[PDB]
């Protein structure tokens, strides 16, 4: 954990989080985000810190995927990659919904 000693499950690109373009990196036990062309992740959340997950449909000028944490905080991920947004939006959702039941289990 913390260090780059974990495998990457999914690498999403041109993912804008908080109006800034970066990349969405899915990890074995957590989800992280880092701006485009960067090596230092700015956001990191373990699948056990995620309470709920929502998914913003197509139709907007921005496609999104958000994680509602038990703390009340919410991390909405905007897939601004015209070429893989929709496709990666599902890929992340899929991995998340599949990983969540493995980490999410503590009556909270």
């Amino acid at each position: 954990m913390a260090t780059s000693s974990e495998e990457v499950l999914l690498i999403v690109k041109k993912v804008r989080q908080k109006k800034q373009d970066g990349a969405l990196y899915l990890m074995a036990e957590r989800i992280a985000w880092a701006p485009e062309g960067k090596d230092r992740f700015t956001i990191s959340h373990m699948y056990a810190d995620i309470k709920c997950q929502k998914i913003s449909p197509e139709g907007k000028a921005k496609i999104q995927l958000q994680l509602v944490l038990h703390a009340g905080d919410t991390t909405n991920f905007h897939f601004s990659n015209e070429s893989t947004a929709v496709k990666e939006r599902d890929a992340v959702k899929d991995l998340l919904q599949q990983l969540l039941p493995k980490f999410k289990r503590k009556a909270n």
């Binding site: 908080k18 109006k19 309470k51 709920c52 997950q53 929502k54 998914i55 913003s56 449909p57 907007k60 921005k62 999104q64 958000q66 919410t74 909405n76 905007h78 959702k93 919904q97 969540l100 999410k104 289990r105 009556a107 909270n108």
Partner: peptide, 22 residues
């Protein structure tokens, strides 16, 4: 919000998991 955060135009989701909290 205070600035131009995500809720600038966002809360039209399908909340994949809005029930279980186990």
């Amino acid at each position: 919000d205070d600035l131009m955060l995500s809720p600038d135009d966002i809360e039209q989701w399908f909340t994949e998991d809005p029930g279980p909290d186990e």
